[model samples]
Target chain A: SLLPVPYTEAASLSTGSTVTIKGRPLACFLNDPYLQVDFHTEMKEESDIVFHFQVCFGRRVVMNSREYGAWKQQVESKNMPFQDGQEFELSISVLPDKYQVMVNGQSSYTFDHRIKPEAVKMVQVWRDISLTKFNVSY
Target chain B: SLLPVPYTEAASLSTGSTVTIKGRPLACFLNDPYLQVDFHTEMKEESDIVFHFQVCFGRRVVMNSREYGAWKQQVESKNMPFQDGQEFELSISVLPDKYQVMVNGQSSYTFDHRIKPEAVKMVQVWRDISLTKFNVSY
Candidate 1:
């Protein structure tokens, strides 16, 4: 609760639901500093990351997959969302077909599910960016 | 119900609630475009607005306030939240003391309530930019 950047396990999300990564990039911007919010298959044991949503400090935003004990590229955005250390709120809403990513409240990207999204069991937050809030809404 | 922008009402807020606006700016880059999220004391009457939260797309990003019919001095920053022709997910969350804003899932601004936050009646969204989603949550 006191650390500048904290980690949390929130409720699992399903169809017609959404998750918001409500945080700001660190004031000391750097190349490696990033935030990753992952959806896990299970909390205990070696679980697969159903969805790995991460944004780097610089201009690159990458979304990778950790399945079959290896990381694979799903998709990425070359466009920088955070310009000059701007704050942001990102929402990933679940759909039957794909995950809709709405950045800064605008509909931005869609990530198709390689695994069934209903197979997701846990939500995780990992960040070097200073996080102020995180929540899951129906 | 069909408009450029939409409206939603949250139950109320404490130190940690969020307002996420999803939308895209017009294709052409312009000097003056904006999205304003206003919190009012009462929806039916022209009463006092607790916070006139707005983000402008121009040479820089500016956050201005209006309370009791007088405009306060504007707070300007060079970090732009909304890029031209781009979708975005902007969030404004309530901290213990002030409202923290995130543009594209990153930190941007913190606005202190000039008037003590009364019961937040309704959320008003006005967009010169186009909006895809407007949501509020605790």
Candidate 2:
């Protein structure tokens, strides 16, 4: 199912150092839409966090979050841009070395995880954001 | 160097498959231009061959050759659809299983080789299409 707005959630990984998501539903349309993956030191707090997003068109990986903005802002604005009438498959892999985001079957973004790996707990999708499938792996 | 008209070329590979191309120069001022890659098997002396083209905008794969037909008639009728000013990197990788095409390190397209891969002898790029860089691995 698709959400109306961008959403966020925490995954159940302990290390937070590395996480991989697979099989999330994506919306397809002519208007460009964006998708992203966010990492936080604490699920509820915004003080220590780093995230990444991949802007996509259908199954293609257009751009990723780190390509723009500061290190923190890169994590904060990790979401897909706006493109309507398209479908996508998104995945996120968080590692001690870097964050790897893949759309469809291609790697899009890579960002260093600054916080301790064990601090992440919850994973949520953005609101009004349409997805076909998504998943997380350790 | 750029050509005023669209030019196409064909190559036969060892896998008993053929690859053809019709391309234009990367246009300037165009945030993203359509870069298409199509697959075909049957060809005759005067038969019309079908190929696919994909457009890229930054990191986004904005439009495809099919969609371009409905909105932009010149692309289909004239068979010439590249603009100037933008720097584009186009590459083709011929493997035992498939032919992979990548543009600007971001966009990619793949097709199954219909003929023997070893039969593929020549690879040519047409039109205003400038060869920035390309490599083939057996």
Candidate 3:
């Protein structure tokens, strides 16, 4: 419902960087809304993803990464640190061995590196919310 | 310790932006070490500081800000989320009402707004530590 499900990278993604996503979900978010922040190696329609964060309402936050044409085991965090129709911040700090994910102001989860940091070249965000802040820098 | 105390702005600081400081303190950090990240309205010395984030990590993390032409009352968080003689990330996210400060992956503190967001045009970091990353972008 928000901009055709995916907003592909307009710039690029770098290694050891921090990407912060801040936004406001529509009122529809209260019932059924979710968002996904994905890191890809290429801008192609189907490419290898280095990391993925799926924030679901009324459910758990799922973390996973795609590799060699297959998806890894999905990781879940029981904490849903978001409110409907309000502003929230999610900061993803890419580390050497893992990806640190912070929701609101707390540590939600950390996804170990399956894809090399150099392989990551772009960021893809698909959401049912309106983003006011999408920032990435090393 | 000789690099300089006040690292001036290389770019404009705006709302919906994030600043990441990726550095650790020195042996000096154990005794008398403090690092301050200041949001400024200009690049000149001692003009006007909007938000100030200082970490004094001999024991705990002390954070503060500047509002209405005066230094704010100091506040401390019990978590010391960085390692000495190493590298880490301190991300200060600029939100609508406040600047959310996060050391590593945890909430350090929030520095509320005093000056107009648009009026903020610079970033400054000063103190006794070595910096590997001083990044700012929207």
Say which candidate scores most in lDDT: 3
Better of 2 and 3 by lDDT: 3
DockQ of each: 0.01, 0.01, 0.01
TM agreement with the true structure for every prediction:
0.46, 0.34, 0.46
- Model 2 chain A poorest ten-residue lDDT run: A61-70
| Residue pairs clashing, model 3 | none
Q: Model 2, range A14-121, lDDT digits (tens) per residue?
A: 334334333333322331223444454445423233443444434343322221223334233234432344355555665557666665567756656554445555
Candidate 3 lDDT over A68-110, as tens digits, reads 7567898888777787657888898877788888879898788
Candidate 2's DockQ is 0.01
* Residues B16-58, model 1: lDDT tens digits: 6787888765323421345567776666324446676655564
Candidate 1, residues A2-64: lDDT per residue as tens digits? 323335564667788888777765432421245667787776324677787776656567776
Q: What's the best-to-worst order under lDDT?
A: 3, 1, 2
Window of ten residues with lowest summed lDDT in model 1 chain A: A25-34
Model 3: per-residue lDDT, tens digit, B13-117? 567888887766643332235566767666654445666666666566665555554556766776666666555678888788888888787887776776666
Q: Superpose all Cα atoms of candidate 3 onto the true structure and report the RMSD in Å to 1 decimal.
A: 19.7
Docking class of 1: incorrect
lDDT of 3 at A119: 84
